[PDB]
Amino acid sequence: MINAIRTPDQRFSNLDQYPFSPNYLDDLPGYPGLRAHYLDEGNSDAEDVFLCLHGEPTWSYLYRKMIPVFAESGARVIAPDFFGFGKSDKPVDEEDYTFEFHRNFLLALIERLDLRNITLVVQDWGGFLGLTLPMADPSRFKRLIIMNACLMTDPVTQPAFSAFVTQPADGFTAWKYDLVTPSDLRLDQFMKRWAPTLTEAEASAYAAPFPDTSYQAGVRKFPKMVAQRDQACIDISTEAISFWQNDWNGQTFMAIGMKDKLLGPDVMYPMKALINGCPEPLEIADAGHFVQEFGEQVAREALKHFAETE
């Protein structure tokens, strides 16, 4: 029904440090005919599930240094690829991707796999979407690991969650320009700019899912949805603020990539106050937006904080 395309499997032959086996679902309710890929690592019977959500313009490859730490801890880790990214199917028109399309795909996945005792791991889009998930079924979520992300609320309710779209010129403005304007978007070049410590091989794993522009619709829509928040996103993100401030009673661990021009401290301190019980953030001086690239520190500290209360 949704015209979609699928990345050829050979594009992923030569991946650097990505030894995880694929799992796919093509029978989700509301997602007829679309195949979603997700990693399922560690013990499939563990009590704890770390649900690892990625953002723009990445994929589950992003969580590759953190996955083995969470798995060795005894947890089951689920790291799905949103449709339009990684190894899931990719709808061809940008009009098909909406906040709820991706949100509902997450609640569907979660119900489909019946995930319980979830430690939500978010950053960017994975947090814009992922932070509005617990209020939907509070009982299945028990901890949160939040790296640079916030809620897509209206400007008046939280100016901090909106100011970054316009200032500074080299933060979000540049990021969106680099993503929506080029008629020939090279994701390996994009990633090396925004994540300067990546090796060539790593950079190239981020361009792996997209052979040509035709597979990039999902990638182009995300930034435009940060810029143009529709009513449903606004409503639902507004309502999640209340959930984190008042309803939330789990364990949280926050890690800020200090060099992030997009969602660094001016956005993370504010988020930290709205999340009940959130503790002092772990500032990682050398990390930019992709906190995950400095991921192992994050995973072991989180697990250390979490054990120190369990």
- The active-site residue, picked from 37, 54, 102, 289, is 289
247 counts as catalytic: no
Confirm whether 124 is a catalytic residue. Answer: yes
Q: Is 125 annotated as a binding residue?
A: yes
**Which is catalytic among the residues 124, 137, 154, 247?**
124
Q: Name which of 56 and 81 has its Cβ closer to Cl ion.
A: 56
Answer yes or no: 48 catalytic. no
Measured from the CB of residue 248, what is the shortest distance to Cl ion in angstroms?
Answer: 25
Q: Check: CB of residue 141 under 8 Å from CB of residue 106.
A: no
- Give the CB-nearest residue to Cl ion: 56
Q: In what order do the strands lie in the sheet with 76-80?
A: 23-25, 36-42, 76-80, 49-52, 118-122, 141-147, 251-257, 282-284
Are 204 and 164 in contact by the 8 Å Cβ rule? The answer is no
- 165/240 with CB nearer Cl ion: 165
Nearer to Cl ion, 164 or 244 (CB): 164
Amino acid at 125: W
Q: Which helix (H) or strand (E) holds 32?
A: none
For binding to Cl ion (CB under 5 A), which residues are involved?
56, 222-223, 226
In the complex, minimum distance from the CB of residue 222 to Cl ion, in angstroms, rounded to a whole number:
4
Min. distance of Cβ 176 from Cl ion in angstroms? 7
Pairing of strands 118-122, 49-52: parallel
Count how many residues are written for the chain: 310
Between 83 and 222, CB nearer to Cl ion: 222
Q: How far is the CB of 226 from Cl ion (least distance, A)?
A: 5
Residue 59 assigned as binding residue: no
Catalytic one of 48, 81, 96, 260:
260
> Residues 268-272: contacts with CB within 8 Å, 24+ apart?
268/148, 268/150, 270/150, 270/158, 270/160, 270/161, 271/146, 271/149, 271/150, 271/151
Q: Are 15 and 203 in contact (CB under 8 A)?
A: no
Annotated binding residues, as ranges?
125, 175
Annotated binding residues for chloride, as ranges?
125, 175
Catalytic residues: 124, 260, 289
